[PDB]
Structure formats: structure tokens, C-alpha cells
RNA sequence: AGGAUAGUGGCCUACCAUGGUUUCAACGGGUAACGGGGAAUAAGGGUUCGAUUCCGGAGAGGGAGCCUGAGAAACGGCUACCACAUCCAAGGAAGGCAGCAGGCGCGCAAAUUACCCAAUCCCGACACGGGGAGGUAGUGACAAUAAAUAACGAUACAGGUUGUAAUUGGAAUGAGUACAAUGUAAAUACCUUAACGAGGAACAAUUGGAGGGCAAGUCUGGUGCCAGCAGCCGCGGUAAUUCCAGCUCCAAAAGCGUAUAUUAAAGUUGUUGCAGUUAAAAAGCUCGUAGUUGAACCUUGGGCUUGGCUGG
């Protein structure tokens, strides 16, 4: 038959289900960023856990090693590109110092709210899901869309959205049309 | 099991064809021909995946049935004809001549050549021996049999085939300092000069080759193809890159400068 | 020297000694002897269907005092007879003689659970309908 | 043992209907509800924090 | 409303007597552009016969306002009828959909004929003699 | 030495020697054993799995023997026997789904007797025919990805310039439905998109729990060592924080629980890395072959010249 298509899990659950310190930290972190559930926090921790694992393996290698220089610079470049890592912290030792709030800062939902396009973080998610927000000239309705540094300046209302110069929506057309 | 196989699963095809996993279950099984299955490039892959002249396998057969495609100066209508190293592909409708030479990345480059160079080819001498009625002959790497060769020609030499009469123009003896391309292994596609040939009776002889950047590598004698009489004097045009292997960091640096 | 060989050429002694001593591990021993295949009523399966022979009340062990209401079930796959607990207040009335019941373990992996003596299985479904669905009046027994 | 008393307590439990109540919000809204209820308008009893205080 | 067509990755293909390219369609305030209308527009742009133009494989981007597909322009209508697939000519009205029985019926008829050696006329003539 | 084979060879035959394997485990037995690439879990070392998308092998109900052919000991080829099993006018004849779909049975356990050669490729005398190979759709909570179930104002209050708790508004949107176009071999669906499509926005989120482990009640009613719960410890004998319910609350959520196996936890299999006085465990004591393991010692120092890379 046809070759199998690869797939993988993008999160991992905690080993201890009930822990007040972790439960309170997660809920506090979900409330700040308007997350739907704990899996959206597990996903960030999971992908951050493997960034650290890659950095740890390179840090065990000797300096000036060809693999450490090549993959280390590439890993740093990718994190700098999405704005998670600062431009003055390109050392692969600051990669280990990253925290989950650094990644949640770069979500589209967080950036819409912090750019003033929404009243609250929860207003940001519904604006995104309802096809009002466009990055560049492309409508993005994924709240977890990680905004790149070069995409930061091009976040705005979609040109065909009621809030961005489009026609009036379904509700208004029914009201002013009666 | 009871006879020859006639299918080729997509995942089991040679990796240098650069076929995608999900386009289907099967891959073109090269026909029997001058080149081995694993070291060949079927014309269907060349005309559809490389040149993108044909959009699918039905169209490449339409192209070849109109007598357009020539391999080594002869019209071929077999869509899975196993074209190989040093073969010349001519499409006179587009006025294009290609030679199948490995690039340094291990794949068959799309290497366009002039019409004057498309009038000949090189072949590595595999064996020299006497045929019936005591007539000596040479077997090249592409299965050609040339009778009455120059009595100085021996194995591992390279002959220049006129490719229109099939005769030998002249040859290059295998010796130190000759220009070489590697046609097998992980050093496939690299170009350098022979530094030292290390003999192993009953085993595999090893050849030490020095790159133009003074990088030295070792490969089996069976993967060595003499392509020039000395450094910087190849008998065919080399593909872009000149068979010089760059490290991944060097390639990344080169791509950054090329794109700004 | 810790009572085990340390020489660089003593891999055979170390490998054989571990192989001999894993037989003291009952989890390993039960897996290779195939005891579940040979001795277990389910034959190694997670579940097994059977026919209810009779409804029987079983007295709980001390210090508890109750009548644990189980059934006698003859398994279809091998004809063996086992006792299965019927959980939830009043679910014994959902189980009648000559009904087909799906059984499962108590989760103690072949041991009795709680104060119920000699019972290692529980009823999961009766007449093809979940016992939990019957208890919560989500479904009705097909009869 | 006698099987006659099966389902005794559940049968004689007085039936009480569930009081009709507004639906609670689902998804992201519910995390928002829990977050404010636990970290914005804190109801701590001077260091005494209870999720389900019984009426007393 | 101001449909804009861009062609990229253009390859001249005299082997199949056609020019082939990727088509970018900008159609703001428009669901999409029909294939029939693109063939009309492409014919005017490149001054070719409408029947020598073939487009296919179009998809609209997320959020709308733009579609991408593939297009072919043949040197003549005769060349198009020679190299185009049959199903595309039926799309363009240049050919009639061939009428055949369903795949089940064709196979069943083939297996029934496997039981007859010689002509059908002889087989039925012999059957009539046997039953008479 | 011959015969046979496409060919080597005790492959077989004749004659002749008495050899060959084995505690470094031969031989025999078991395997709920096709092998491998790989899979799960994993600090490291490991443990478990691999019928199953690729490669190799074997088989076509069980054996055996063959024809044709370059290639088969072929089974959608034949011959025979055994076991099943079909039609019969009773003389005879015809079989092989571990191909696709489908049926029975078995069971804890697994989908349509659908469309097509348009793609991937294969076969043929072949640009044209064929392909249940393959592709497309159907069923599909096996697993995996993203991701709705609401958002924002005003009053009224409480509250410390703003977070809510309620009753008052106007906006927004896709679930769904649909002109149409796209998609496709033709469709379906997706993506686009006219018109329709949200206040209890009934367009109503569930699954398990609330003594401890383990997050969340010493609330109310019922029963009274009964009914039942409870992985374990335990609860229940008239104010039960544990049963049956209502309320409230907790956890994960389009998912959640249960059973079984397995991995980590397990330094409870210990090479890394266990324990053996008394918790389990030093043979009663010596000898001893294999195995394992075995004291020290043989060109060291010195001198001169020079290449490269790190710091400056």
C-alpha cells in the first residue's frame, strides 16, 4: 500500500494528576492568557521541554564542535525569529532559561490583545476565531498562531471584516434592514 | 519466488530519484538496459520529475512515442529506459542536450551541454579480453562492446566514444594525477585527482583522491571514474559546483550571501 | 568482591545467573510459563461472556457484614464456571438465569477484591446492555 | 444468604427532582470563571480558603 | 470585479506543442472565477483560441480573494484535441462523453463470452438446434 | 570412481575407512515463534513488543507428483489420495476467497456484495486494450492535529482609578442550510461565497469523584452491619464528611471511566546497581575439572630544529 503518514503527539500530561501548587499555577497561567483548557498549557511545556533537551545535548559537546555550532546557531536563530529569545541572549545557555510565559507571549491571541485590537484577552480569541484578524494579507483564525518578529507589524483587522472596512455583519444587516 | 519481479514499491525506489512518499504506491521500475537498476534514471523520472515537461506518466509516454527522446544518439520509446552515468539525452524539438553526471549532492544533475559535446561520451573500461576468432574487445561501464581497441587500453581506463559510430576516439590510462569523479558510495559526485592507489589482492583496491580544496578522501576502485587527463582538464563539462563538497555550515553561509 | 564475577570475560556467568534468578520473580515466571493461557478462567483475555447459572448471595468477610450478591456463570469459550459480582444497589434484579453476561476482573489481576471471598470477576453487561445503563435507567433490558 | 432485599435502599429513597438551573459556561469561558473566582475576587477568610464552604 | 491573472513558472513545451504555467487569480469581492471565464480571459491576454486553453486544479486560499491553479495553452485547437485528456475535452465541450455500460456489466459480459469458443452466431444457432 | 544436476556437494550409487557434534550446552522438548527495518516506555544502563504500509521467507483445505515455459514443484495450472463439499434424469460432471466485497461460525475483538482506471504503476502484438494492483467515496471516538459551546457596553449595587456579582442593550460569528463556482474520471467533502441561520444565544458538555493516598463538604433528606460502597486503608449497628439522593464543589473535557497486558515507578532481577549474623538467603567440611581471575620486570630521559591552533 501507500507509505504511512507520520504523526505525533504535541503534549504530555503531568505524572501527578492532583497537586495544588501545579493546579494553581496552571489556572493562573490559563486565566492570564485566556486559554481554553490545560492541554494548551501542556502543549507549551511539551514543546519547551524538547527545546531544552536539544540545547542540553549540544551543551554537553565541546565548544567549536561542528554539530554544536551548526544546530546550536539554528536553534537560537529560530527562537530569536519568533521573538521568544531576546537579541542579546544568543548563547544557547539562555535557551535553557526560557519559560512557558515566553511562548504564550507570542501567540496571536496575546498579540491581538496587546496591540489594542481587543478589549481583553478573551475578546482577542473570539476576534481571531471569527475571522476578523489578518496577519499580513492573510486571515488567520488560529489563536495559537505564533507571531514572528517580521509579522508583528502586520497584525490588523481583515480588510473584509466589519471591524476593518468590510460590510456590516449578519446582525446589523437584519436590524438596519428592517 | 518463481520468477523476476516486475513492480517497484515507492518506498523501495532509489533515494536519488527524489520521489515523494505519498504520490502513490509504486515507482517506475527501470527496464533491463545498459545501466543497473539502482544506478540508473528512468526517462519517466527525468522527463516528469526533473524537467517537468510532462505532468504525469501518461504524458511522458506521449512525448516519447513521437520520437522526440534520444539516449546516446538513438531514439528510445521505453518510458522506463535506464539512462545512467555519462549518457546523453537529446530533445531536438527543444534543441536541448543533457548529460547525466552526478552532482556533489549525490543526485543526477540537470546538466545541459552543447551540441558539439553531445556528440561523444566517456565509458569506463570494465574488462578487456578476446572474443571469438581471437578478436579483442572492450566492455565499458554502460555495457558497450567495442572491438579492435587500442592494445594499450586496460581495465579502469576511460575511453571516449564517438557515439555516432560507436568507436573509440582516444583513451586515458588510469594513473596517479588523473581527474576523477566518484560514481558510488557516500562520496558520490565528488571530483578530484588520484593521489595513491592502494592494492589489496583478493579484496577491493582503494584509491586516495584529493579535492580541489585539498580535501582527501578514500573510495573503492569500483567507484572511481577517470574523467580527465589531469587536474582542471576534464573531458566533459562538469555540473555546477565542480564536484567540490562543502560542509553544511559552508552551504548555509553560501546561501545567505547568495540571497543577500 | 560483592559475590558476583567481575572479569571482562565473565559475561556468560553473569547472563546465565540473571536468567536463573528471574524465575524467582512471579511476574516473569507467570509470563513465560503461560499460566494465564493454561490456568486462568479467561484464558488471558480481559473479558469473557457466559451464561448465568444461578443467583447466589455470598457473605462478606469479617469485620464486614453483608450479603454480596453474585452469580454463577459458565463461560462460553471454555465451559468453566466462575462467580461474578453484580455491582450497584439492586442490579441483581437486572440479571436473570440463562442470561448472557459479559464479565471482567476486579482490577486486582486474579485476586479477590475487598471483603468478597473467592470472587474475582464482575458483571459488565447483561443481554448485550450495559449494567450501568440499566442502573441509571438510560436503557431497558431487551426481553 | 437471602437475596430478597436486593435494591432495598435505592427503591425506598424518596425521589427528588433536579432543580432547573442556568447552564454553566463551557470551554474557555469556564476557565475564565474559575480564574476570577479564585484569583481576582478572592474570598479567603483571612488565610482560610475553601472551595466548598458548607453553610455554618 | 477587476479579476487579475498572473502566470508564473512558465515552461515552453514544444514536445507536447503547448505552453504550461501556474495561474494565480486575484478575485476580491468574488467567490472565485469559473474555469470557463478564465479560459476566456487567458485567450484574450495571450491572443490564443479559447479552445486551445486548458485550466484545471484550482484552489482558493484561506480567507478567499485569491485562487491558484494550472493552465495550458496549445499552439492550435488541433494540438489541444490531440494531447488533452478526454475528460478535460468533455469539460470544455470539445468532445462527447463516451457511453459505455457500468464496470460491473462490462466485466460480467466479458466473463460470459469466455464460455463460448468461436463465433456467437454459431453458439446460438447450435443452442436453437439443441432446444428444437 | 561414477550417476544425476544448470552447475558445486553423500545430492544419490558402488567400494572403502570410522568418523562428525557436545557443559563454550550438543541432542531432545516448549514457544499463546515467520526473521529484520522497526514500536512502546525510557536520566543512563535497560525491559517489553514487532500477525500488520518496506525488505527477505513460506503457503494457497492437508500431503505428494508433474505439464508448459527463460522462469513454477504454480494451485484464480493439471494428476492422484485424504477431509470437506456442489449439480444429477443416478449414467456422470464440476470444486478450492490466507485476492476484493460479502455470508456462516468463532469469539472480548474488527467496515460496502459501492464508483473508476483520472492518478501511481504493471502487463500485452500496444500512443488506443486490461488491471477489486491501485485510486475514490461509504462505515469508522484505533490512534494523531487544530479547534466552537460565547464577547463587549449601560444601570444597579458591593468592592477595593477598576474585577465580579444581577437586568438591560446593540453588535460579532460559525455549527447547520444553500444558490453558484471550485474540487473530481463523475461525484462527496474541504477551501471560497449570494440569501438564510443566536438570548434561556433549549444551537442547553460530558465523564468520574468530594475520609486518606488525592483536588474538592463534617451541608440536607433517606437506610440503619441492611442495602450497598470500598484498587488499598476502611465506611455502614438511628446527628454516615465514604452507601442511596438533592445542593454545592473538584479534576480532565470532546472526551472521560473500567478490564487485561506491558513499560516507568522497581536499586522489588541490581553490568551500571540489591541482599545473605538476627527480616528470605553462606553448601556440614575439605578436595577438584571446565569456567572466571591471576606479583613485579625489557627505550626512559636529554638536546636541537620546525608546522599548526588558543589567549593576548
Swiss-Prot record, chain A:
Q: Which GO terms describe its biological process?
A: ribosomal small subunit biogenesis; translation
Which terms are listed as keywords in the entry? Cytoplasm, Ribonucleoprotein, Ribosomal protein, RNA-binding, rRNA-binding
One cellular component term (GO) for this entry is: cytosolic small ribosomal subunit
InterPro entries cross-referenced by the UniProt entry:
Ribosomal_uS4 (IPR022801), Ribosomal_uS4_CS (IPR018079), Ribosomal_uS4_euk/arc (IPR005710), Ribosomal_uS4_N (IPR001912), S4_RNA-bd (IPR002942), S4_RNA-bd_sf (IPR036986)
Concerning Pfam families, the annotation shows: Ribosomal_S4, S4
Annotated ranges, domain S4 RNA-binding: 106-177
Compartment(s) where it occurs, according to its Swiss-Prot or TrEMBL record = Cytoplasm
Stretches for region Disordered = 159-178
Q: What is its main location?
A: cytoplasm
Q: Which GO terms describe its molecular function?
A: rRNA binding; structural constituent of ribosome
Q: Tell me which PROSITE patterns the record gives.
A: RIBOSOMAL_S4, S4
Quaternary state and interactors: Component of the small ribosomal subunit. Mature ribosomes consist of a small (40S) and a large (60S) subunit. The 40S subunit contains about 32 different proteins and 1 molecule of RNA (18S). The 60S subunit contains 45 different proteins and 3 molecules of RNA (25S, 5.8S and 5S).
State the protein's purpose: Component of the ribosome, a large ribonucleoprotein complex responsible for the synthesis of proteins in the cell. The small ribosomal subunit (SSU) binds messenger RNAs (mRNAs) and translates the encoded message by selecting cognate aminoacyl-transfer RNA (tRNA) molecules. The large subunit (LSU) contains the ribosomal catalytic site termed the peptidyl transferase center (PTC), which catalyzes the formation of peptide bonds, thereby polymerizing the amino acids delivered by tRNAs into a polypeptide chain.
Q: Which NCBIfam families does the UniProt record give?
A: PRK04051.1, uS4_arch
Swiss-Prot record, chain B:
What are the residue boundaries of the S4 RNA-binding domain, all occurrences included?
Answer: 41-104
Q: Name one GO biological process term.
A: translation
Keyword line: Cytoplasm, Ribonucleoprotein, Ribosomal protein, RNA-binding, rRNA-binding
Main localization of the protein?
Answer: cytoplasm
- CDD domains attached to this UniProt entry: KOW_RPS4 (cd06087), S4 (cd00165)
The molecular function GO annotations come to:
RNA binding; rRNA binding; structural constituent of ribosome
Job description of the protein: Component of the ribosome, a large ribonucleoprotein complex responsible for the synthesis of proteins in the cell. The small ribosomal subunit (SSU) binds messenger RNAs (mRNAs) and translates the encoded message by selecting cognate aminoacyl-transfer RNA (tRNA) molecules. The large subunit (LSU) contains the ribosomal catalytic site termed the peptidyl transferase center (PTC), which catalyzes the formation of peptide bonds, thereby polymerizing the amino acids delivered by tRNAs into a polypeptide chain.
Its recorded name reads Small ribosomal subunit protein eS4
Species, as recorded: Candida albicans (strain SC5314 / ATCC MYA-2876) (Yeast)
Name of the gene this protein is made from: RPS42
UniProtKB/Swiss-Prot annotation, chain D:
Q: Coiled-coil regions in this chain?
A: none
**What keywords would UniProt list here?**
Cytoplasm, Ribonucleoprotein, Ribosomal protein
Looking at the record, which segments are called Disordered?
Answer: 1-28
Q: Which GO terms describe its molecular function?
A: structural constituent of ribosome
- Please state where this protein is localized: Cytoplasm
Its main subcellular localisation, reduced to a broad class, is cytoplasm
Entry-linked Pfam families: Ribosomal_S30
Q: Quaternary arrangement and interactors, per the entry? A: Component of the small ribosomal subunit. Mature ribosomes consist of a small (40S) and a large (60S) subunit. The 40S subunit contains about 32 different proteins and 1 molecule of RNA (18S). The 60S subunit contains 45 different proteins and 3 molecules of RNA (25S, 5.8S and 5S).
Similarity-based family: Belongs to the eukaryotic ribosomal protein eS30 family.
What is this protein's function?
Component of the ribosome, a large ribonucleoprotein complex responsible for the synthesis of proteins in the cell. The small ribosomal subunit (SSU) binds messenger RNAs (mRNAs) and translates the encoded message by selecting cognate aminoacyl-transfer RNA (tRNA) molecules. The large subunit (LSU) contains the ribosomal catalytic site termed the peptidyl transferase center (PTC), which catalyzes the formation of peptide bonds, thereby polymerizing the amino acids delivered by tRNAs into a polypeptide chain.
Name of this chain's protein: Small ribosomal subunit protein eS30
Q: Which gene encodes it?
A: RPS30
UniProtKB/Swiss-Prot annotation, chain E:
InterPro entries reported for this sequence? eRP_eS24_sf, Ribosomal_eS24, Ribosomal_eS24_CS, Ribosomal_uL23/eL15/eS24_sf
Would the keyword Isomerase be found if you checked this record's keyword annotation?
no
A Pfam family per the record: Ribosomal_S24e
KW Protein transport (keyword) present: no
Chief site of localization: cytoplasm
Query: Basic residues bias: where?
Result: 103-113, 122-132
Single GO BP term:
translation
Any idea which GO molecular function terms this record carries? structural constituent of ribosome
* Gene3D superfamilies, per database record: 3.30.70.3370
Q: Which UniProt keywords apply?
A: Cytoplasm, Ribonucleoprotein, Ribosomal protein
Quote the subcellular location field of this record.
Cytoplasm
Tell me which GO cellular component terms the UniProt record holds.
cytoplasm; ribonucleoprotein complex; ribosome
Ranges for region Disordered:
100-132
Self-association and partners:
Component of the small ribosomal subunit. Mature ribosomes consist of a small (40S) and a large (60S) subunit. The 40S subunit contains about 32 different proteins and 1 molecule of RNA (18S). The 60S subunit contains 45 different proteins and 3 molecules of RNA (25S, 5.8S and 5S).
Which protein family is named in the record? Belongs to the eukaryotic ribosomal protein eS24 family.
Q: What does this protein do?
A: Component of the ribosome, a large ribonucleoprotein complex responsible for the synthesis of proteins in the cell. The small ribosomal subunit (SSU) binds messenger RNAs (mRNAs) and translates the encoded message by selecting cognate aminoacyl-transfer RNA (tRNA) molecules. The large subunit (LSU) contains the ribosomal catalytic site termed the peptidyl transferase center (PTC), which catalyzes the formation of peptide bonds, thereby polymerizing the amino acids delivered by tRNAs into a polypeptide chain.
Question: What PANTHER family is this protein classified in?
Answer: 40S RIBOSOMAL PROTEIN S24
Return the protein name.
Answer: Small ribosomal subunit protein eS24
Q: Specify the species.
A: Candida albicans (strain SC5314 / ATCC MYA-2876)
